[PDB]
Hints:
Chain A is mainly beta. Chain A contains 7 helices and 26 strands. Chain A has 2 domains: 1-79 and 307-338 and 392-440, Jelly Rolls; 80-306 and 339-391, Alpha-Beta Complex (adenovirus 2 penton base, domain 2), CATH 3.90.1620.10. In chain A, strands 9-11-16-15-10 form a 5-stranded mixed β-sheet. Chain A has a 4-stranded antiparallel β-sheet with strand order 2-1-5-23. Chain A starts with a strand and ends with a strand. In chain A, 54% of the residues are buried. Chain D has no helices and no strands. By secondary structure, chain E is mostly loops. Classes of the chains: A mainly beta, D little secondary structure, E little secondary structure. The interface between A and F is small, with 11 and 5 residues. Chain G: This is Hexon protein. Chain G: It is found in: Virion; Host nucleus.
Amino acid sequence: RNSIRYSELAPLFDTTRVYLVDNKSTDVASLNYQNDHSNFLTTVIQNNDYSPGEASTQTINLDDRSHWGGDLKTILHTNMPNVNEFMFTNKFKARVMVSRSLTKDKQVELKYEWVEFTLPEGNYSETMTIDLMNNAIVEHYLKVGRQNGVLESDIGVKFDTRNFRLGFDPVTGLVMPGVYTNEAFHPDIILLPGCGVDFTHSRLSNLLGIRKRQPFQEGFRITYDDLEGGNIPALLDVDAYQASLKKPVIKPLTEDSKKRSYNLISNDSTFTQYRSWYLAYNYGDPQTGIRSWTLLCTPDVTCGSEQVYWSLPDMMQDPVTFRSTSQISNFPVVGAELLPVHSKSFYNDQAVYSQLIRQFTSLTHVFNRFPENQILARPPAPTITTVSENVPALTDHGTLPLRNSIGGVQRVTITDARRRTCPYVYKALGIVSPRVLSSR
Amino acid sequence: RNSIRYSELAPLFDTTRVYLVDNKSTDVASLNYQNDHSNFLTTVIQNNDYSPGEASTQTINLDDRSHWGGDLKTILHTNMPNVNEFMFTNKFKARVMVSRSLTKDKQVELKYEWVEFTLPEGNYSETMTIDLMNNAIVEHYLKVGRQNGVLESDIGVKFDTRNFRLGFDPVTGLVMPGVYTNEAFHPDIILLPGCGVDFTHSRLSNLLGIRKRQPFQEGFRITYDDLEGGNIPALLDVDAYQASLKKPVIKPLTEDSKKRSYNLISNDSTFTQYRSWYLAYNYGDPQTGIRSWTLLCTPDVTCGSEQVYWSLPDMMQDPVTFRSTSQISNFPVVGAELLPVHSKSFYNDQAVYSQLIRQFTSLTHVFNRFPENQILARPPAPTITTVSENVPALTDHGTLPLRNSIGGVQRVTITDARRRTCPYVYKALGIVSPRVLSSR
Amino acid sequence: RNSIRYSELAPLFDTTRVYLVDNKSTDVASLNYQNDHSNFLTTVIQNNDYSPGEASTQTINLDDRSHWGGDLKTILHTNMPNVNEFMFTNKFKARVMVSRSLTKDKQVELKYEWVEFTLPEGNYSETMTIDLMNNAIVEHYLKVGRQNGVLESDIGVKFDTRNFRLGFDPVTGLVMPGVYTNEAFHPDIILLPGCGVDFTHSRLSNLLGIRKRQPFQEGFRITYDDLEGGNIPALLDVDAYQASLKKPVIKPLTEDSKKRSYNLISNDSTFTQYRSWYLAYNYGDPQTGIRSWTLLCTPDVTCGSEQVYWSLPDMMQDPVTFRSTSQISNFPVVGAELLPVHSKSFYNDQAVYSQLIRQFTSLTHVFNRFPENQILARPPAPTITTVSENVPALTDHGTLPLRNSIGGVQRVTITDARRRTCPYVYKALGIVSPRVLSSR
Amino acid sequence: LYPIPANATNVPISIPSRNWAAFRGWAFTRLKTKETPSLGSGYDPYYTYS
Amino acid sequence: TFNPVYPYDT
Amino acid sequence: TFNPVYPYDT
Amino acid sequence: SQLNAVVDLQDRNTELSYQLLLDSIGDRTRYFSMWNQAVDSYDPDVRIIE
């Protein structure tokens, strides 16, 4: 009526457990080899005698007269890096200045080009991720920039995280303090005329916390031109003003120590040519600015909760509309589950008291190369850093229909959103508990 | 009896799984486009052949002879900012002084007006949120205040967080220490004669931790006049008293460095014209004061746990009393769930040892502009800051009735309390598992 | 129809609870003795009279006319060390230099050999674990190295955690800063010509966060030869260059204080003979380098989520294909569960500001013995340390079939992946609740 | 509607195996992309023709 | 007669 | 005329 | 009934269908103001120069 028979052993009734597990010493040796914990074979047999493979011949038979089903809970555990190549978090296109030249007697010829910089897999934490990006902009300048004109003064594109506009005085037209108040509010990206960044093929966008208000329109390009209204205002010549006590004030600090120009639009304007995203969003025209088509969001280092799909092709019936095949990247799905990664949050009031000390701690100002320029400076570390953290996930799918004849060797397969094994799985295993559902 | 048929594939029995998911490469291209993760279409088909849309023609049929239902668990993930425009946490009305004038020979003409200040989306943490508010009060004074008389001495409205009354001596009538003990207890709002704040259209109220004891009476206005009994007492002239060793004591420090007046009611009284909410609550008349109609509550940065409603118009039967429509903002609801945001709490004994160091860390005293005035000073950072944090929510709704003919394309829709898509959704997807419930 | 009888007590119906517990005062005395919390006996009787053993005679009878089953939830609690012998985290083979000699008139005879170093069980935290390893490399040199030639200058194999390549200038061919920027990015292992490490029999590999892209091919050996492309570049002679202001630059610091050679390949090259894994991975040929067959992963101190299997040989029916035996290491399994260990993550911006202070805190530079050599130096402590932490696990297995005659003494057994009791169990106990499933 | 890139001369179309019972026949033309508003939506941002 | 509203001294 | 792009002074 | 009798497809072409339906049942050459029924045409002498 509801048996469960196996080769030659006492028949069992009503229910039991078949175990899908990678570890088994025997099968690892033989079976999987060129496989990994995301696409492997395993014997469900569990009987000490019998050579695996020869096991493959045997079968667990759930009484034929009834349609069976089984509860499938699984234990999935990864250890995927915040920033890696497979997830698309190690690359990102941006347009920078390539050459600054003296041409055809009087012309200033500026040549800009798009280029894709890559990051060294792993390096978690958001802030640091920013830094690694800024550094990659530089590392490039080091291989092309300088040796083709282009000064530091005109480095296009830099990810910062502050509100260049806190000091700002509605009359002066300047950041009175003479310094862009060094506190971190949200990541944003700053651009110089003519350049900009593109994330079309990168989840890092999600790390900065900047998304399109219309996601499905593939094409994340944020040009200098887009950051309308909201160019970082200029600094008051704190020195002049004070010593001068008319009043100098109108004097908008044009350079800095080591004399770098703050590219001011004209000898008059209080504004600089440096455009900030964060500004355009909440300080620019809400109806036509950038706030119109992009959204200011919480960072999230994981870069985006993605899901993984399970499949047990040789043991569960194929769900409603999937068709059975043998193409690993199209197997039927039997369970979906978010990919095991969380955002742990911490507190480091030590940030920026630490950037200050961190710089001495790290024997180099590698990230802060321009410790004077109020722009190109090293963005403030925000209190509350986030870090992707891997965690085992004791998930639980529902009862799923089973085949009344379970093969000795079952194939287990965890796929990702785009349907492809996921290299970062360290442990995957599931427990199935069959039971009756109705009869034929 | 209980089949589940599809186009031309083997019939399935008893149960299975239909998947509602946004990601699918095909549909994103075609279908949704002008949509977002809170109002999108998706094919439930899952069959590799067939052009989406042409998929739309097909249908999953749950045996007609029985009334089906399906378990609906979903995976929702957002990333909405502590402070943003859509949730109503970036604005807040307050009444400040606009002009101080010398008029009609002997009159002192004070003109006050209401004005709505806005904040720059994002900027989490409660303390900092306070600061951003105080700053907005200022930023306004900078554009209107000064250039119309009104000194700093008479800046109306400032959010602080301390107990101006710890030093207080029941005889002296003064805060003996000569300083308002710089420790943070709870946010409160201080007012000068004639001004005050209004939150009628803002959840920030909930951030300060001040609520009406009768919520539904739309209208949160807290006037200076309301903060009866409980005007910040004055400071002992620590210098005079000591040097003087009658005893000066009665001397209530009238100004401070950079000479700002502490607006004392009269040449006699030990009390200042500055009224504090926090005082009125526990130091004023309990029967008629403010403690009568407002409640001192725990902060909470999220500003208020709000819920979101799901709807699968084309797949579930319409719950008891909802009527079926096509107006996105009235679809039937099938599941309610709190909007994925938590209050992570941290410890920063570094607070106020940090405000002290934070000020040097941040190259500007942007928030502390009046580092002398014991009132207008920068509120102490409280130990234990809170920060809204986004978290994926693996929720689980119950079994819901299904239509016996499931369309190829289903429409998924997550709405909010007021019934409107929620821009801050990054991932939404659900799994439905149909099963029999009775027959016709 | 569905009784539950016991010796001579009123019959019970429908369900109840049998308790499997180690603690019992009586049985501990008699029964188990030479056993431990992972392989013990216990009386299910629970009746105050009756000598255990004599209890063993009695039996709980679940009505014969029906097939019973029981829900089995358990409470498991361990306290296993991050690094211990049983889990294979206290040993690890590496190949180091044994002797440096002056031979047969002009030959420099270098003799290398493999050797297995062990660690002192316990010592959690990842960073520190690294240190303990590096120290073991040394401790060996102290017993063989020096007293056979081999200088410190040529110590093969050292686990570090930084990106020897941040300073690097694409033109100079040197790390301009004159110092390998002292910040921690990921663990990696550095090798000198001729040597290398092997983890074939160790989970520490998983601690460093370096795994094979093809796990099942038993054999983790990472030779110097493998770390192709990606030898730690050399340091700029910061002193020479500066004082010299042609420009010295080309000068790649050959030694350091206490004069140790940085083994530079030749009097010309800017590269040193020191090869770094981390470099080869993301800085070397992606198609043939090491990134081809190894994967950069998140650390994880636990060394690898392993599972444990339960078995109640004398109380549950033997699951589908297991056969009943009496060989403790083959009992049938009735429930699988991950071994109770998590990775708690912390923040210590105090790292490297602490290594700096930690060295004075610890009255010895035991781990930093070579505080000058930019290589052999003590790796930077990474912000965000991990620590294996034991946690009680209130797990829940499903309903499992029962024997209709439960013996007075049941045998409980928790096994591990390889099938062997696990010494680190402090508390194990389960609750079974039988109930009917069908009839005979 | 199947796209014909500028200068393209070959247009291959494929229809995955399906049912053809009651099929009546084919009818066809050629249109200019510029003169064909996109109907897979309530509004076509790229439609600049009247 | 312009208040920068900022304590430049300290 | 070579920019090391590094503030050696400090 | 609250059930929608209307069921459309992106795949259908209502406007065109109506254009063709009109031609089959009458003289598209005639104008009818009520429905803005005035077919698009061109001068034969312009399309083909004689």
